[PDB]
């Protein structure tokens, strides 16, 4: 049904994302248990880490386009990522390695992420209809990888420990690298223009030097968030000031403010929503005992189901507004499950958490898929810069928001934590409901401006 290179790209993507989510799903619990952070520290640090993971993507896109090539940067990024995962394994012996390891992962991701998408959209002539299908299939592969990692990574960590987990993440990166290399043949005429000239060692050296400077800067930032806050505040206010000095770009700015809200919301799945599942939800479903951390796998799961369906089934400000409403509903459902359908002992049905994740995934299916690709139809380099900037700012802010649900180590009564989760979740759901209402109000104006 699809070209031969499609399936290569599909599986390299699956394994890379398997490693990444194998880390994300266990990271905050790792900060709390293994490094003895308090939940407030773990949440803000996870914030900084995601912020860099998503802020650095722009760079990898540019390095693949104009310095090194696309297939080269896929190899380079996979190698730096495997090194990061193995470093994180080695952090258990050497704890002071942890931040450096995370920085490596961030930089590794920043170099790698944008390229396979580029590679994929060159396996097809410019108007081949199959494109859309492949893209959704591409998304599904990401989510299959995510689905598997979040399912098994915590189980593995509990029965064998964080070193074995992280090394499995590495091993998955190595598997992706071997697939790509053993299929170099299939991509012999595919790539960007630097993939067919010989490799400039000058540029390669600059990319290595800068990668390493960026690794040490990531590590400095995740250990000292207080200054990461200021770095991104100044960078953001200044890039909006040079956006406000310099009609479709204004609709892009409104769409980015809403995407920022949606990313603040997405940031909760690995932190506060995770700890809500740990603390106030039954750890059994259909009679099976499950590790509560595995509940995060519910996000990719619904995506994997609903994206075919929803790909089989207005336009831009409308779909954005729809997604906003969906996320609003996810948090109102969480708060309501806490406030009214709890046991005498403060525990709640995991079916309520399944519904939360369904609402969240639908919101993702609208906002995340559309906004990035269609901010590009509204448009440019400066706005990807600012788009990744503000998404990173969103993750920082999400971590700060998570801290409102943080629980001291000595609390052991679900009935004492339950009111805290429901107060924060209700307030979140209500604020984003107001936001989606204003969005709806502004929808027709924006549609006229887009035309």
């Amino acid at each position, epitope marked *: 049904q699809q070209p031969r290179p499609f399936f290569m790209i599909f599986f390299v993507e699956l394994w890379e994302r398997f490693g990444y989510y194998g880390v994300q799903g266990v990271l905050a619990v790792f900060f709390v248990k293994q490094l003895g952070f308090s939940q407030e520290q773990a949440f803000v640090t996870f914030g900084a880490f995601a912020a860099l993971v998503y802020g650095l993507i722009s760079i990898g896109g540019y390095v693949g386009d104009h310095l090194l090539g696309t297939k080269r940067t896929i190899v380079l990024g996979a190698l730096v990522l495997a090194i990061g995962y193995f470093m994180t394994g080695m952090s258990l012996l050497k704890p002071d390695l942890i931040f450096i390891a995370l920085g490596t992962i961030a930089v590794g991701n920043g170099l790698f992420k944008a390229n396979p998408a580029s590679l994929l959209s060159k396996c097809y002539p410019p108007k081949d209809p199959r494109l859309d299908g492949a893209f959704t299939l591409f998304y599904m592969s990401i989510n299959i990888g995510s689905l598997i990692a979040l399912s098994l990574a915590p189980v593995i960590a509990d029965r064998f420990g964080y070193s074995v987990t992280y090394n499995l993440c590495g091993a998955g990166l190595i598997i992706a690298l071997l697939v790509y290399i053993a299929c170099r043949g299939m991509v012999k005429d595919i790539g960007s223009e630097p993939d067919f000239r010989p490799m400039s060692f000058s540029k390669l050296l600059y990319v290595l030097l800068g990668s390493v400077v960026m690794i040490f800067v990531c590590a400095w930032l995740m250990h000292n968030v207080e200054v990461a806050n200021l770095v991104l505040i100044v960078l953001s206010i200044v890039v909006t000031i040079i956006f406000f000095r310099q009609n479709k770009m204004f609709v892009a700015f409104v769409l980015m403010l809403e995407a920022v809200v949606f990313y603040i919301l997405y940031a909760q799945m690995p932190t506060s929503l995770n700890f809500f599942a*740990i603390n106030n939800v039954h750890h059994e479903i259909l009679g099976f005992s499950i590790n509560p951390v595995s509940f995060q796998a519910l996000n990719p799961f619904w995506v994997v189901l609903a994206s075919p369906i929803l790909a089989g089934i207005l336009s831009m400000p409308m779909k954005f507004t729809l997604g906003m409403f969906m996320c609003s509903l996810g948090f109102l459902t969480a708060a309501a499950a806490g406030m009214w359908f709890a046991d005498a002992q403060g*525990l709640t049905s995991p079916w309520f958490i399944v519904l939360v994740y369904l609402f969240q995934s639908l919101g993702e299916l609208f906002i995340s898929a559309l906004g990035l690709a269609m901010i590009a139809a509204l448009v440019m380099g400066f706005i990807l810069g600012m788009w990744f900037l503000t998404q990173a700012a969103a993750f920082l802010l999400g971590g700060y928001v998570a801290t409102f649900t943080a629980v001291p180590d000595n609390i052991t009564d679900p009935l004492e934590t339950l009111p805290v989760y429901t107060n924060v979740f209700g307030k979140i759901g209500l604020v984003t409901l107001g936001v989606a209402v204003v969005m709806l109000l502004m929808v027709p104006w924006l549609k006229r401006m887009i035309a």
Partner: nanobody, 122 residues
Framework: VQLVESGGGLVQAGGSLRLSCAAS????????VGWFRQAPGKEREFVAG???????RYKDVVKGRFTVSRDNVKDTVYLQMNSLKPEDTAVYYC?????????????????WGQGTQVTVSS
């Protein structure tokens, strides 16, 4: 998933037993461990427990007398029972729930030891 209880016995009032809960596959470090007891003719009731980061919880009637503690090296959880009274006579179960919470009812706990008889005589 599977806990091994040990330490039960017959003791005279004012005497002292120590129960112990260890686990097989998983590490008990990621678990709150509660000790429940079922007296003849009654339902399982929460005695005392310790969460995954050393938070403690106790039933009123055992405060002062029962101490919960955790050896993370040996991967074991201990319950010291001093000043025992005849109403402490029961089957004692340990239960493990992942994380930092210690709910009061047996339904908040998915992994369960086999039970151990404790008898305290007058």
């Amino acid at each position: 998933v599977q806990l091994v209880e040990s330490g039960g016995g017959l003791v005279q009032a004012g005497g002292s037993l120590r129960l112990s809960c260890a686990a097989s596959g998983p590490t008990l470090s990621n678990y709150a461990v509660g000790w429940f007891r079922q007296a003849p003719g009654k339902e399982r009731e929460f005695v005392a427990g310790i969460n995954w980061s050393s938070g403690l919880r106790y039933k009123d009637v055992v405060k002062g007398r029962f101490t919960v503690s955790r050896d993370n090296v040996k991967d074991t959880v201990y319950l010291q029972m001093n000043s025992l009274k005849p109403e402490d006579t029961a089957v004692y179960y340990c239960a493990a729930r992942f994380g930092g919470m210690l709910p009061l009812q047996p339904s908040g706990y998915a992994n369960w030891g086999q039970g151990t008889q404790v008898t305290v005589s007058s």
